[PDB]
């Protein structure tokens, strides 16, 4: 498996993602990032049922939560309804309990925006810091 | 307590609620309905912790889920950023296990949209139909 | 071109689409419908720039608006994060100035929800009723 | 007029703002920030019609766009459905063409999250940098 298969993703900007200024409403970018992260994990081969609560086939609710503790974005060029965006993800293990993902959005080969999302692994019930789930660790390693 | 206190509500249309057509994006109406229903329950005097999962002060997760089984809306006049909307709610008990709420949205005294949301009471763990929670029944009765 | 290519679509339910009840938050369904309608038009071969305002490559803003005048949905089975949903679209010309689209959502071959969205064609500047744009008429005809 | 009237704002976390982890879904924070900024401008006394496109009563579409070029947030404590959040806004003029707003969210007197949004003033048609609109400059000055 070539990592581009799960780190190079694509999406098309839809009409409801825009505001009356005629361009993407800013916070939608973060939704797109989160969804591309989920898509990446899926494409690498992880099962949603093992990572995300609310999943149909979980035998138990996943034990480790991955709350976002920081995120940011820079908006460089306007993004429009119907734009085909090329998304490149670059994950980084920060320590045994945390990781971040950088997201770069290109349209017609030019960078239109980029974002960074940082997660901490905690026990979902105690909220104490804990080790990253094994599947997330495999994905981080494979994506090096 | 006069029921208008919890059935007549107000909100202002915000920029992110609009699309590049220069008017409210259609599905936002439903979010506004749901939020006004929550506001109504709050204004009548019910505690979120007794009705909605995810609440900070629940001693246990609420036992009865109120899934939406049907909803609809008619859009009659365009709705714009910065519009002050007067919302009137009209709840109806349908049977011991179900209710619906009608929402009318006025701007400058004219009806711009209206919607209807129907809920069924089910046990959150078994998903069997069950009786409406007592607080919801009090609200329905008070709102007659 | 076989119409299934643009009327049979797929999407995966993402974590942000769910609420603390552990299932899809109801109004997201409508967003999914609208986005699948846009996807259908794209897949049939229409150019966003000719239909939707806010598009990058429009020579002029499209002259005909397609406001939603009515929509509704029935929710039959719970929908969960990571569910693969098979979406089937069935468009219907209603008259020379209007159409609706029916959306059926299946998961593991069973209908989980369905929705209906009705549009009116109006001149974007005058807001008078007008004929459907030619591309939308081609799509309706091809989808018969 | 005391600036707290437009810089100290309040909102209640609603059920649709949460995900299946049982807490606010991260990107909603940014929507809340943007809406509180709009609320602040309104509360200071500015007219939406002069600042935001899509407004009902604009004689012409506002000439100056205020695109967000950067934003970020830190999430410190979990935020739950029904939480009453105290929002404090701290605007800063950066130069004649730009400003940022810092947003602090408190619940039960403790900081749960904070965010920063930076805007650039551009001519809406040319997209060249330009001076801040006079009303935004009045608000910035009053909020010092």
Swiss-Prot record, chains A, B, C, D:
GO biological process: any one?
phylloquinone biosynthetic process
This protein's pathway: Cofactor biosynthesis; phylloquinone biosynthesis; Quinol/quinone metabolism; 1,4-dihydroxy-2-naphthoate biosynthesis; 1,4-dihydroxy-2-naphthoate from chorismate: step 7/7
The UniProt record lists the EC number as 3.1.2.28
Q: Which reactions are catalysed by this chain?
A: 1,4-dihydroxy-2-naphthoyl-CoA + H2O = 1,4-dihydroxy-2-naphthoate + CoA + H(+)
Protein keywords: Hydrolase
Give the positions the UniProt entry annotates as the active site: 19
For this protein, the record's SUPFAM superfamilies field holds: Thioesterase/thiol ester dehydrase-isomerase (SSF54637)
Name of one Pfam family that matches:
4HBT_2
Any GO MF annotation of the entry: 1,4-dihydroxy-2-naphthoyl-CoA thioesterase activity
Q: Which family does it belong to?
A: Belongs to the 4-hydroxybenzoyl-CoA thioesterase family. DHNA-CoA hydrolase subfamily.
Chain's role: Catalyzes the hydrolysis of 1,4-dihydroxy-2-naphthoyl-CoA (DHNA-CoA) to 1,4-dihydroxy-2-naphthoate (DHNA), a reaction involved in phylloquinone (vitamin K1) biosynthesis.
Q: What is this protein called?
A: 1,4-dihydroxy-2-naphthoyl-CoA hydrolase
